[PDB]
Design a protein around this motif. Structure first.
Motif, PDB file in Angstrom:
ATOM      1  N   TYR C  69      42.599  52.525  33.128  1.00 26.38           N
ATOM      2  CA  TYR C  69      43.184  51.190  33.248  1.00 26.38           C
ATOM      3  C   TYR C  69      44.494  51.095  32.468  1.00 26.38           C
ATOM      4  N   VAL C  70      45.176  49.958  32.576  1.00 19.80           N
ATOM      5  CA  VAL C  70      46.440  49.761  31.871  1.00 19.80           C
ATOM      6  C   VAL C  70      46.273  48.797  30.702  1.00 19.80           C
ATOM      7  N   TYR C  72      47.112  46.159  27.798  1.00 21.77           N
ATOM      8  CA  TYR C  72      47.989  44.993  27.751  1.00 21.77           C
ATOM      9  C   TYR C  72      48.803  45.044  26.464  1.00 21.77           C
ATOM     10  N   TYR C 157      45.528  49.772  38.843  1.00 19.46           N
ATOM     11  CA  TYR C 157      44.991  49.832  37.491  1.00 19.46           C
ATOM     12  C   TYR C 157      44.748  48.424  36.984  1.00 19.46           C
ATOM     13  N   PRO C 158      43.518  48.133  36.544  1.00 18.90           N
ATOM     14  CA  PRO C 158      43.218  46.798  36.034  1.00 18.90           C
ATOM     15  C   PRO C 158      44.223  46.436  34.942  1.00 18.90           C
ATOM     16  N   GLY C 159      44.789  45.236  35.041  1.00 19.94           N
ATOM     17  CA  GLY C 159      45.751  44.762  34.059  1.00 19.94           C
ATOM     18  C   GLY C 159      47.193  45.208  34.230  1.00 19.94           C
ATOM     19  N   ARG C 163      50.417  43.612  32.320  1.00 24.73           N
ATOM     20  CA  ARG C 163      51.219  44.408  31.395  1.00 24.73           C
ATOM     21  C   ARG C 163      52.695  44.322  31.790  1.00 24.73           C
TER      22      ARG C 163
ATOM     23  N   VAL E  29      44.426  38.991  30.467  1.00 20.45           N
ATOM     24  CA  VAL E  29      44.785  40.172  31.238  1.00 20.45           C
ATOM     25  C   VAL E  29      44.011  40.281  32.544  1.00 20.45           C
ATOM     26  N   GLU E  30      44.757  40.421  33.633  1.00 25.24           N
ATOM     27  CA  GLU E  30      44.194  40.529  34.970  1.00 25.24           C
ATOM     28  C   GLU E  30      43.185  41.668  35.095  1.00 25.24           C
ATOM     29  N   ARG E  31      41.979  41.322  35.535  1.00 29.57           N
ATOM     30  CA  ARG E  31      40.899  42.282  35.723  1.00 29.57           C
ATOM     31  C   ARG E  31      40.458  43.041  34.480  1.00 29.57           C
ATOM     32  N   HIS E  32      40.588  42.405  33.323  1.00 28.33           N
ATOM     33  CA  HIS E  32      40.158  43.016  32.073  1.00 28.33           C
ATOM     34  C   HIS E  32      38.974  42.216  31.548  1.00 28.33           C
ATOM     35  N   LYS E  34      37.228  41.967  27.747  1.00 23.94           N
ATOM     36  CA  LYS E  34      37.277  42.438  26.368  1.00 23.94           C
ATOM     37  C   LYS E  34      36.491  41.587  25.387  1.00 23.94           C
TER      38      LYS E  34
END
Ligand SMILES: O=C1CS[C@@H](c2cccc(Br)c2)N1c1cc(Cl)ccc1O
Lengths: 341, 399, 196, 137, 167, 281, 174
Positions: C69-70, C72, C157-159, C163, E29-32, E34
């Protein structure tokens, strides 16, 4: 009457019109539909399209259409063709996960609460043959966790992480027409803020309108249950619980509520209109190492029969993967001290 | 510094220990520890290792070391205590250590090892080398090689199981490893049966004794079974040998003839079906299968550099027979091609050298003797400031 | 408007005007899917898993697609990787062996934003995207900023859309608003990153 | 590689901002205490809490006054006092108790644990839940 | 001790109030997804941190959020040997944090050991048993540290006697 | 193994093997071995000038000059006699064994060869033990830097001989563990009333040395008080065998103590994980 | 791997799917007369000690089927030769053994019925029965000059040691 569908959470559920089938998301990207065969439950359908965990499901009774929303930011309206359910993509125009969804009583629209700090009101245009949506933004400042429609299909209650329970007008003149006045207000232009609670504590996990809609109740993380009375200038009755936070709530009569949550069992609350006071009236689950039917938090409750005016049976699903069916008359029999109104 | 690094290679039935720079290990001891069996006081120090642990009355023998099931870390740690303080007599804080792990050992096990070495024994530096890679380095001693390389196929055969390990640029191609259920023990058992059906006067309770001895003193690999059998049946006086041992009970002498088993024992590497009903692949075929499973671009180099490691690869002409048989399978394959359709002939070379028996320890000893070894080791300072995770990766070096 | 595209071969930021595209103002990134798979192989090696670049390329590619994933805020991601185990996920290899993957999940894709990590010169997909729009026409800058859209495997990639958004805010605030916090609020950014 | 140093999120208009704006009678509490009227002192110390002030000085002051009272208490007289309070009082008490846990000194926590026990018996775990989700404390 | 049970009782109650978590998709954050108590990018999702102390040295910090809770403990360490034994033991367990999945790899500054419990843990494990575990843990690390202390002293006497007796 | 051994196994096994094959009449194999021992000692076993019929055992101690000033050369010659030869370059003492001229009892010389290091240390103790027995007081104390940053002081008094060790605990926490062991040594007479008295000073040398003796948080001083019953001609050898291994005996047990604590931690952690997993449905 | 026969000829005849190979013998039977200095029987006896250890055997020619039969029979001979005291006596037991009716392809009791073709008619039957007997007889007497050492009463242990492994794990007495 408890039944274990799995050992992982049942994220959300929805029943069809005749309560013959239940749709559940098994802490999955999928929605499983079950049906009873004799006294056994059998899986009859598997709805796979979402690319993220499904967080909300609602079933339109008459049109028999299922709507689902997920963390993949999508929403799908499922239509039954023969022996298979087919999905239609609905663009919510959001950049965060969707959290909840509810069809309006008239089945002409559905609302989706999201992490984009907005509510997407979707409707179909038989003109361009696709689903469109308008956003209700101001003054939502956080993720929308719960939603519930007013019987008039215009007013919509919402609970969010910004500690507020609000009532908006989701008035869409192109699918319905000028709504009759309501004690909540005469002016209901789209997105109009009709009501906003006055507390800055606790995420609002669940909201619910009474059968006639003149009353709205909600439960927050600060272990309180509240009820706003539109017939008393929107006066708010509050009740601080001595136990853990409630995640779900529904009216069973104009003056009675049933809620459940982290305690793992359903409880009863009554509203005294005269005194404008809320009162705790009992544990409804009277007999791992727990004395309750559910073995983990109960996250959703729905009325199975009798409606919100005179509910006779209700359902609860929880993070334990179990689904319970409660009979109100049976409860009254086993608890001679039970109130209800 | 003026002090050489410690080199410890732990086998499954033998631990080889000594100081870097030496050609042979200073000690080769059974990888076993004898203990007494709520510990109090100094009960934990009441143990023995190696030979001193195989026959002790009041103690129970353990081999915390195997391909099969899990590492007993408590016992491994104690085992190291005597390796350091009893046999090597090295002040652990003054010596860098080179330990060896099997290929496919996990990163976690590497951290467990470092925890013991740095937090128990306070070593200044540590390096964990993969056995197969040291075996390759060990072959650099061979007359058959002219350039140092860490790309080759290692055939490790001890007493338990035989491994065919492909290595490319110093790193084992894990996904292509193959194992063979034929090793020293199997050879011994087969020879045992052969004697049981022919010779008399062999004390049962001394059955293994004779077999192992016959194997170690008279076994070898022959080019052809029938031709060999014919040899023995003609000039028996100069092919059949005699062995004589003493009855542990009665102290009298028993004499037996040694024949076919001399070449029939090591033969099971090439014809497993002779003794193993569940495995039939000849070692030559296993090697071919492994190399063909590797990247086309790395194959030929693997065929050109097949190295041996372990006492079970010590039989006279083991390599010659492997090389021949492998060349036949590969040449036969390229025969079909041409006919069907000029693939350049594939050069197959099986390297044999004098340090095979303990090729792993020797490779470790030679490498830990160089300045570069000290450059690549993980220091106690870095272990302390960065953590045991730094021991998860040990850079290859020496070429 | 700008359609940041990236595949298993190369990356592209193609600016398009009403009709059509414009080569001038079109740039390519020397980092894509395969490069990320390669960097992941290097990262896993440091974790103690020695995967062969050829023999196991597909295996590591599958690991990437399932777990990568990416990040943030890399500073925050690294804290999660160093101070907790919430990022660790188990992955079963074809031969049955189970390995544990953590911080490397966000580290590998980070190469897209910090090319030097894999020894490549450049400024990163984000800074590159910024320079393309900043230098372009003035009468489309605003429009472009909310008509950037993605496509190509290496963008799911999620996020990622997030980002990118954050990196552009940082660039715009520094190289355009001079640092005038009090005016960024009204710098509209919208990343189109559709469902198909 | 600077531009990533700045946390642009701190200026995001689509964040969340708490509603903010701008203590008990010390002399009164002392009066009750000097006279041995403990329950009275408790109820006075729980009056007009600085739930809206910004400075930690004023909050730290009320906490001291309240803590002063809890420490002055006799073990066997805690239950009675706690039961003389209404639910809101119990909830507020619980907030102060947790406050006290942050400034231990000579068995101060020893008696506070006694207060927590009694307060919990009265307000249930819910009173603690409300210590957790209070935005103004 | 006249203050052990009262301490653990208070800690247990607070853990029960704090361990009421639910799945929460990232708002930032999109699709995160946490643990909010760790990233802290959304102040409204964080709960009030609370401390429970037994004395000036022993205490437990509990920080909640909508989908996670961070629990830090300050362990009893009477003397030098107990201080080093505790440090080695906590380090030992943290190095194995992946197997001991509710443990943080590093303690919150000011504490000896920290736990990070997420909604995923409360989903696959009975939250009341997790609460039982933390209390059990606090009780057992103390007993183990005491036993370790006795062990070192016990072996020390035999070691001094073995050497001295041989002269 | 509680007490550390005095003999070097590598020396003994190497020689034993060479002597057995020589006696058997076999042709000699080449030998080249480089190894160590505690206290920075380095050994070398080889065939001088490639002559495989000759085996040399050499020892290197960075502090040999100091032992030499206290009778080392004389003692060594008394013990090894003709086996002692001119030291190999890089080493302080060399023993030479002629495989074509071995004694009747080959085992006896293998034993003394294994004690090479011990015998090098012996002289300094025998010297001061003798001083005590002769009543020669006031003699300057012996100062042996057996390690780069560790020193041993030997001094003879009217009724006793004192041996002081200035040791270093590189690992901060090892100091704490070491103090536990030293306290038990200090109370040792409660189990053996005739045993030597032991004193311990942390971070500071005994007043008599308050000289250029080292001072620091990781330094520790240990004092053994040896009496006539320990220093006489009858107890002498055994006492020397013990005292010269003390420093390493202490550090050995600190490390074994840490290993044992590790087993405790593996057990407790293992149990914690079982409880944790029982929390799952 | 196992040793196969190199005696199959383009003009070699068949009895069932077994190779009707020539042999040098005085015994009666349909076996052609062999002119060369070696025949299938010598080959089977030459390869025996090695082949007998093999568990698997690939049938390359109809000559192998004949080779296999003789190999299995050699085992039968060793079973009997094991218990005898003299070269003379051994020859008699071998005559008897060779005459006894051993099972043929198609009958239960004959292993490898999945690899050997059963006789199609009564003629083919009797002819195969004759060939097999002729092979048994020649194999048996030829084996005697091998098993016994010029020192009478010596069923060489170097031949006796195989009395109980079974080529391809099969048996004619089974
Ligand atoms: O897993 C590893 C990493 S390196 C090797 C090892 C060799 C010698 C001492 C230690 Br302690 C570990 N080791 C190992 C551990 C066990 Cl428990 C059994 C065999 C080994 O080779």
């Amino acid at each position: 009457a408890y039944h274990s569908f799995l050992v992982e959470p049942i994220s959300c559920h929805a029943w069809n019109k005749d309560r013959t089938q239940i749709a559940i998301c098994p802490n999955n990207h999928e929605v499983h539909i079950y049906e009873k065969s004799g006294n056994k439950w059998v899986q009859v359908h598997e709805l796979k399209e979402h690319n993220g965990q499904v967080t909300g499901i609602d079933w339109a009774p008459d049109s028999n259409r299922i709507v689902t929303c997920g963390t993949d930011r999508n929403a799908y309206v499922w239509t039954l063709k023969g022996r298979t359910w087919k999905p239609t993509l609905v663009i919510l125009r959001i950049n965060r996960a969707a959290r909840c969804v509810r069809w309006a009583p008239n089945e002409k629209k559905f609302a989706v609460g999201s992490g984009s700090r907005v509510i997407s009101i979707c409707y179909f245009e038989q003109e361009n043959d696709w689903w469109v949506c308008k956003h209700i933004k101001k003054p939502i400042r956080s993720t929308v966790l719960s939603l519930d429609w007013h019987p008039n299909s215009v007013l919509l209650a919402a609970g969010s992480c910004d500690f507020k329970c609000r009532i908006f007008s989701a008035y869409i003149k192109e699918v319905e027409e000028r709504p009759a006045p309501t004690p909540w207000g005469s002016k209901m232009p789209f997105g109009e803020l009709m009501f906003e609670s006055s507390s800055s504590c606790g995420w609002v996990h669940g909201v619910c309108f009474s059968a006639n809609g003149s009353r709205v109740a909600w439960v927050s993380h600060d272990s309180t249950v509240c009820l706003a009375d539109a017939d008393k200038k929107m006066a708010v009755a509050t009740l601080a619980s001595e136990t853990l936070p409630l995640l779900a709530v529904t009216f069973i009569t104009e003056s009675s509520l049933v809620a459940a949550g982290h305690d793992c069992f359903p409880v009863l609350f009554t509203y005294d209109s005269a005194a404008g006071k809320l009162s705790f009236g009992g544990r409804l689950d009277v007999p791992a190492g727990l004395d309750s039917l559910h073995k983990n938090s109960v996250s959703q409750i729905s009325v199975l029969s009798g409606g919100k005016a005179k509910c006779s049976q209700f359902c609860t699903t929880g993070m334990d993967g179990g689904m319970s069916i409660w009979d109100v008359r049976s409860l009254e029999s086993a608890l001679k001290d039970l109130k209800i109104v | 510094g003026r002090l050489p690094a410690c080199v410890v290679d732990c086998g499954t039935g033998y631990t080889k220990l000594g100081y870097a720079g030496n050609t042979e290990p200073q000690f080769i001891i059974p990888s076993c520890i004898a203990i007494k069996e709520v510990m109090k006081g100094v009960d934990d120090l009441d143990f023995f290792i190696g030979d001193e642990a195989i026959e002790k009355p009041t103690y129970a023998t353990k081999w915390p070391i195997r391909h099969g099931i899990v590492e007993d870390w408590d016992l491994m740690e104690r085992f190291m205590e005597q390796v350091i303080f009893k046999y090597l007599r090295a002040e652990p804080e003054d010596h860098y250590f080179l330990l060896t792990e099997p290929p496919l050992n996990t990163p976690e096990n590497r951290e467990y090892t470092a925890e013991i070495m740095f937090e128990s024994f306070n070593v200044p530096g540590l390096y964990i080398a993969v056995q197969a890679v040291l075996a390759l380095a060990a072959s650099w001693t061979s007359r058959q090689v002219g350039e140092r390389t860490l790309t080759g196929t290692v055939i490790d055969s001890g007493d338990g199981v035989t491994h065919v390990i492909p290595v490319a640029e110093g790193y084992v191609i894990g996904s292509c490893i193959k194992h063979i259920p034929i090793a020293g023990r199997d050879i011994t058992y087969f020879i045992q049966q052969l004697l049981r059906d022919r010779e008399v006067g062999i004390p049962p309770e001394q059955s293994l004794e004779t077999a192992k001895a016959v194997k170690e003193r008279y076994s070898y690999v022959c080019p052809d079974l029938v031709k060999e059998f014919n040899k023995y049946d003609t000039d028996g006086s100069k092919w059949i040998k005699q062995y004589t041992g003493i009855n542990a009970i009665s102290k009298k002498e028993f004499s037996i003839d040694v024949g076919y088993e001399r070449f029939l024992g090591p033969e099971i590497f090439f014809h497993p079906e002779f003794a193993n009903p569940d495995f039939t692949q000849p070692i030559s075929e296993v090697v071919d299968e492994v190399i063909q499973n590797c990247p086309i671009d790395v194959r030929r180099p693997l065929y050109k550099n097949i190295v041996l490691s372990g006492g079970s690869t010590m039989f006279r002409d083991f390599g010659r027979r492997l090389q021949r048989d492998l060349k036949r399978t590969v040449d036969a394959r390229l025969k079909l091609s041409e006919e069907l359709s000029k693939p350049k002939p594939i050069d197959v070379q099986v390297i044999t050298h004098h340090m095979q028996r303990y090729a792993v320890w020797f490779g470790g000893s030679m490498l830990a003797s160089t300045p570069e070894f000290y450059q690549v080791c993980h220091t106690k300072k870095d272990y302390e400031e960065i953590g045991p995770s730094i021991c998860r990766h040990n850079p290859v070096f020496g070429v | 408007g700008v359609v940041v595209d990236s595949g298993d071969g190369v990356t592209h930021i193609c600016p398009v005007y009403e009709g059509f595209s414009l080569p001038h103002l079109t740039r390519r990134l020397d980092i894509a899917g395969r490069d990320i798979t390669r960097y992941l192989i290097k990262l896993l090696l440091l974790r103690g898993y020695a995967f062969n670049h050829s023999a196991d390329f597909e295996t590591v590619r599958m690991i990437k697609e399932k777990l990568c994933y990416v990040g943030y805020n890399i500073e925050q991601e690294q804290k999660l990787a160093l101070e907790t185990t919430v990022l660790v996920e188990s992955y079963t290899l074809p031969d049955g062996r189970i390995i544990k993957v953590g911080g490397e999940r966000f580290e590998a894709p980070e190469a897209l934003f910090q090319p030097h990590l894999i020894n490549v010169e450049g400024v990163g997909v984000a800074e590159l995207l910024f320079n393309t729009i900043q230098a372009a026409d003035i009468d489309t800058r605003s429009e472009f900023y909310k008509h950037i859209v993605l496509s190509g495997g290496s963008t799911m990639y999620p996020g990622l859309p997030s980002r990118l958004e954050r990196e552009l805010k940082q660039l715009y605030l520094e190289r355009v608003l001079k640092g005038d916090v009090e005016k960024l609020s009204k710098f509209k950014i919208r990343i189109e990153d559709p469902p198909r | 590689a600077r531009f990533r140093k700045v946390d642009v999120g701190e200026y995001d208009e689509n964040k969340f901002v708490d509603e903010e704006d701008g203590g008990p009678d010390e002399g009164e509490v002392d009066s009750c205490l000097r006279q041995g009227n403990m329950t009275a002192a408790l109820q006075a110390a729980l009056k007009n809490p600085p739930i809206n002030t910004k400075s930690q000085a004023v909050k730290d002051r009320a906490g001291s006054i309240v803590l002063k009272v809890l420490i002055s208490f006799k073990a066997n007289d805690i239950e009675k006092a706690v039961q003389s309070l209404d639910k809101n009082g119990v909830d507020l008490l619980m907030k102060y108790i947790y406050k006290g846990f942050e400034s231990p000194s000579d068995n101060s926590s020893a008696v506070l644990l006694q207060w927590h026990e009694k307060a919990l018996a009265a307000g249930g775990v819910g009173s603690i839940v409300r210590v957790l989700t209070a935005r103004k404390t | 001790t006249a203050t052990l049970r009262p301490y653990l009782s208070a800690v247990r109650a607070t853990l029960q109030a704090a361990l009421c978590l639910e799945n929460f998709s990232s708002q930032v954050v999109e699709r995160h997804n946490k643990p909010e108590v760790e990233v802290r990018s959304s102040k409204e999702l964080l709960l009030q941190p609370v401390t429970i102390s037994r004395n000036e040295k022993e205490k437990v910090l509990i920080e909640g959020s909508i989908n996670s809770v961070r629990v830090s403990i300050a362990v009893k360490q009477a003397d030098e040997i107990e201080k080093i034994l505790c440090h080695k033991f906590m380090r030992f367990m943290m190095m194995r944090a992946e197997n001991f999945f509710i443990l943080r790899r590093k303690p919150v500054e000011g504490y000896d050991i920290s736990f990070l419990i997420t909604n995923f843990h409360t989903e696959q494990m009975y939250k009341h048993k997790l609460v039982d575990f933390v209390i059990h843990f606090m009780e057992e690390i103390d007993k183990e540290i005491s036993e370790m202390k006795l062990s070192v002293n016990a072996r020390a006497r035999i070691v001094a006697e073995e050497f001295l007796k041989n002269f | 193994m509680i007490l550390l051994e005095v003999n070097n196994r590598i020396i003994e096994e190497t020689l034993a093997l060479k002597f057995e094959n020589a006696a058997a009449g076999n042709k000699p194999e080449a030998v080249e071995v480089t190894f160590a021992d505690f206290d920075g000692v380095l050994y070398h076993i080889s065939n001088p000038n490639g002559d495989k019929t000759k085996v040399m055992v050499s020892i290197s101690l960075k502090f040999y000059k100091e032992l030499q000033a206290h009778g080392a050369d004389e003692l060594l010659k008394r013990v090894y006699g003709s086996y002692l030869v001119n030291p190999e370059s890089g080493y302080n003492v060399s023993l030479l064994y002629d495989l074509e001229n071995l004694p009747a009892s080959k085992d006896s010389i293998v034993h003394q060869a294994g004690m090479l290091k011990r015998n090098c240390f012996a002289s300094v103790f025998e010297k001061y033990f003798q001083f005590q027995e002769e009543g020669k007081e006031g003699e300057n104390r012996a100062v042996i830097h057996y390690r780069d940053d560790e020193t041993m002081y030997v001094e003879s008094k009217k009724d006793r001989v004192t041996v002081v060790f200035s040791t270093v605990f590189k690992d901060d926490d090892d100091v704490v563990i070491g103090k536990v062991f030293m306290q038990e040594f200090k109370e040792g007479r409660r189990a053996s009333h005739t045993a030597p008295q032991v004193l311990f000073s942390h971070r500071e040398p005994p007043l008599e040395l308050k000289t250029d003796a080292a001072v620091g948080d990781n330094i520790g001083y240990i004092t053994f008080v040896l009496f006539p019953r320990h220093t006489n001609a009858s107890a002498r050898d055994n006492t020397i065998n013990l005292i010269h291994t003390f420093r390493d005996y202490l550090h050995y047990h600190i490390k074994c103590s840490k290993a044992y604590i590790h087993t405790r931690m593996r057990a407790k952690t293992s149990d914690f994980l079982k409880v944790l997993n029982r929390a799952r449905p | 791997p196992a040793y196969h026969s190199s005696l199959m000829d383009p003009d070699t005849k068949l009895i069932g799917n077994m190779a009707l190979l020539p042999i040098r013998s005085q015994f009666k039977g349909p076996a052609p007369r062999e002119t060369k200095d070696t025949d299938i029987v010598d080959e089977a006896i030459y390869y025996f000690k090695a082949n007998v250890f093999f568990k698997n055997y690939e049938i390359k020619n109809e000559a192998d089927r004949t080779l296999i039969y003789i190999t299995l029979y050699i085992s039968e001979c060793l079973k009997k030769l094991q218990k005898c005291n003299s070269k003379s006596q051994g020859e008699k037991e071998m005559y008897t053994l060779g005459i006894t009716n051993f099972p043929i392809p198609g009958e239960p009791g004959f292993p490898l019925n999945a690899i050997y073709a059963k006789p199609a008619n009564k003629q083919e039957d009797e002819v195969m029965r004759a060939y097999l007997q002729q092979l048994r007889q020649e194999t048996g007497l030829r084996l005697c000059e091998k098993v016994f050492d010029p020192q009478n009463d010596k069923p060489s242990k170097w031949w006796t040691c195989f009395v109980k492994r079974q080529f391809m794990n099969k048996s004619l007495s089974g």
